[PDB]
Amino acid sequence: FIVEDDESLGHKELKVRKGHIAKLMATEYQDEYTWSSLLNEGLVEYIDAEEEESILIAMQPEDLEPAEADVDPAKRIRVSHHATTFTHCEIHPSMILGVAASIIPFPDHNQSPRNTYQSAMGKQAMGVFLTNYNVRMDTMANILYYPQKPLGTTRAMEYLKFRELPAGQNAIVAIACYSGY
Amino acid sequence: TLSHLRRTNTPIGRDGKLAKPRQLHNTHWGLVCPAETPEGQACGLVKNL
């Protein structure tokens, strides 16, 4: 998000507004306001690594901007809104992730390596790779009888076409010692 | 099926290029996934966008 301080009424701010949004969602509804325009409308840019070297980005848009007024005792502890030099802003941090990662619930709550393991087995599981396997003469392939979509999800999945082609089931887990098997 | 499509192979010297390569860089932020890489062997030499 280009965050030029192009705001006579205020300071710096995303060169896009709640208007652009409802104007885009307009098309989310009737499936007219493209992403293509969100570029031409100098609303957001494609920053390669090199160029990135010379810019300042605020993580969460909102938060790292306004003024002030005791945080939340249950939430986490996030760095502040330092400087206003902010050139651009993040679509959402979750975007540093890739396919794999993206399906991992609360990846921000595990040991660093654990999230890497899941990045390998998700590629070793069963599922429904394509709803055309009925006409697929591919040597070897597995499909689950009753594919259940996940209970815990990510917005990232919505795009990874998951809930429609899941890779498992929601079994009722019971974490405890029993027979000892 | 997806993960594999958006992938990254990157040759090495001739033996375990243990140092610079394999590591996770700052310039990696946002472009490559930070936790999804193949364990052992070519760990970090092959990346996922």
Binding site: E13, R17, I21, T34, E62, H92, R155 | L5
Partner: peptide
């Protein structure tokens, strides 16, 4: 006010626009 700030929840829709146009395969294709 078709011109107001942009809360977090909003951004998600933007991303939607992305894949609507680009596509998970963006790279390989183009």
């Amino acid at each position: 006010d078709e011109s107001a700030p942009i809360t977090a929840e909003d951004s998600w829709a933007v991303i939607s626009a992305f894949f609507r146009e680009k596509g998970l395969v963006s790279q390989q294709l183009d």
